[PDB]
Write a protein that binds this ligand. Structure first.
Ligand SMILES: [Zn+2]
Length: 455
């Protein structure tokens, strides 16, 4: 098997190329073996709306079956619906066959075993099982399970909208189209659908709401139709993007402010987790309402683990994964997060533009990317962590180098998947912002004077 498909938080490859049917089988074999080792013979299996789904999933299922596992096949569903299955079915294991937000040819696996979402060394351990033939053998079973109606009802029964809203819903032709428009409607909204037909060719924009260019059609439709809100889901439904009635994009750190206010209001002292890319204003907001802010690493799987470790009721990260434990199950779920957002907004007399603009904000840069090289990217961060002088800033090295100052903050980290440094800066004033940019510019240039620093 190619080692490269075994990534930090999932398995991902190009179907017919680095991910063949044979490899999918051996992966199912590895996962079923790991599940049995943890005392869990019952595994749910789901797939998104990709072209290779209906056939590749059979290999995954056969791999699991050939271990002696009891497979519950939930068919084509959003990723968090698969996570839901692995919470309400007999078994606490689940495999989602998905290529997320990537081009049509990509597919892969997101993996929960006996309640744990696998990351890092646990994903490498699956490959090692295959290479070592450390695999179970048995005669397993397959049961067809229709879980979407249970998921639908679960959400509808617990969400209480206070006023009707008109909402544009952009699914980007991904699998969220099976439920997001119908569920939002059932909550008491009018829904304007955009690209809600499931189509693995992704013939319109690719379903990745983290890139503003993929929100252009959403913003245009919201304004044209005088809608109250726009929502965009990623390909598999574990992420959501948000635009207000005037078309302002609301980033996940700002969405988390609204969610934290609400959750902490019912749950004094609750831990709330966010990643190192989130605004410092979110830290103050959480603390101000009496919650405990916990800053952690970027990365869906890691945030999820941290939630279990801290007992946090809510977590989110800047790419759009939002995790509710309060009233829910603790997994990331763009569809449920959209329902929770609608619940809050419906209770307010203000438009969604003014709900969000009431919150404090720093002056911030956009996210900055600098392309370096695969040979240099981690060493640049190490040099910054080892040799840079940051003055009196609170330095966080959980994930790159973040420095929080009394009036601003800055981050540089290396991308896991590309030869790129990722940066963001904020401050309460322009003067302070420039001071913080200069500290980072200077520290970077002190590592390599030819680094292409664009700020
Ligand atoms: Zn996703």
């Amino acid at each position: 098997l190619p080692a490269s498909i075994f990534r930090a938080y999932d398995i991902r490859g190009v179907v017919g190329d680095t991910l063949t049917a044979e490899t999918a089988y051996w992966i199912g074999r590895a996962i079923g073996s790991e599940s049995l080792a943890r005392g869990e013979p019952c595994v749910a299996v789901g797939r998104d709306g990709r072209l290779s789904g209906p056939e590749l999933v059979k290999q995954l299922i056969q791999g699991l079956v050939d271990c002696g596992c009891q497979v519950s096949d939930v068919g084509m569903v959003p990723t968090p619906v698969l996570y839901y299955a692995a919470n309400v079915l007999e078994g606490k294991s689940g495999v989602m066959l998905t290529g997320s937000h990537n081009p049509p040819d990509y597919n892969g696996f997101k993996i929960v075993v006996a309640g744990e979402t696998l990351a890092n060394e646990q994903i490498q351990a699956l490959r090692e099982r295959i290479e070592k033939n450390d695999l179970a053998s048995g005669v397993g079973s397959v049961e067809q399970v229709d879980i979407l109606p249970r998921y639908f009802k679960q959400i509808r029964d617990d969400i209480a909208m206070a006023k009707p809203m008109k909402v544009v819903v952009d699914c980007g032709n991904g699998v969220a189209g099976v439920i997001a428009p119908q569920l939002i409607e059932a909550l008491g909204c009018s829904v304007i659908p955009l690209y809600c037909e499931v189509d693995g060719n992704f013939p319109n924009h690719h379903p990745d709401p983290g890139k503003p260019e993929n929100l252009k059609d959403l913003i245009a439709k919201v304004k044209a139709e005088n809608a109250d809100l726009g929502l965009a889901f990623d390909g598999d439904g574990d992420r959501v993007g948000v635009v207000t009635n005037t078309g302002t994009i609301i980033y996940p750190d700002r969405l988390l402010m609204l969610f934290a206010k609400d959750v902490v209001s019912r749950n004094p002292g609750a831990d709330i987790i966010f990643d190192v890319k989130c605004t410092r204003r979110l830290i103050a907001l959480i603390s101000g309402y009496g919650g405990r802010p916990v800053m952690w690493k970027t990365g869906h799987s890691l945030i999820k683990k941290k939630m279990k470790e801290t007992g946090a009721l809510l977590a989110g990260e800047m790419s759009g994964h939002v995790f509710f434990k309060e009233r829910w199950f603790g997994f990331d779920d763009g569809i449920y997060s959209a329902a929770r957002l609608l619940e809050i907004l419906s209770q307010d007399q203000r438009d969604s533009e003014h709900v969000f603009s009431a919150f404090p904000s720093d002056i911030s840069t956009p996210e900055i990317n600098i392309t370096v090289t695969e040979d240099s990217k981690f060493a640049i961060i190490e040099a910054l962590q080892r040799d840079a002088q940051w003055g009196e800033g609170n330095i966080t090295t959980l994930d790159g180098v973040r420095v929080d100052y009394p009036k601003g903050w800055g981050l540089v980290r290396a991308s896991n998947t590309t030869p790129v440094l990722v940066l963001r800066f904020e401050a309460d004033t322009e003067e302070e912002l420039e001071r913080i940019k200069t500290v980072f510019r200077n520290q970077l240039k002190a590592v390599d004077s030819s680094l292409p620093v664009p700020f």
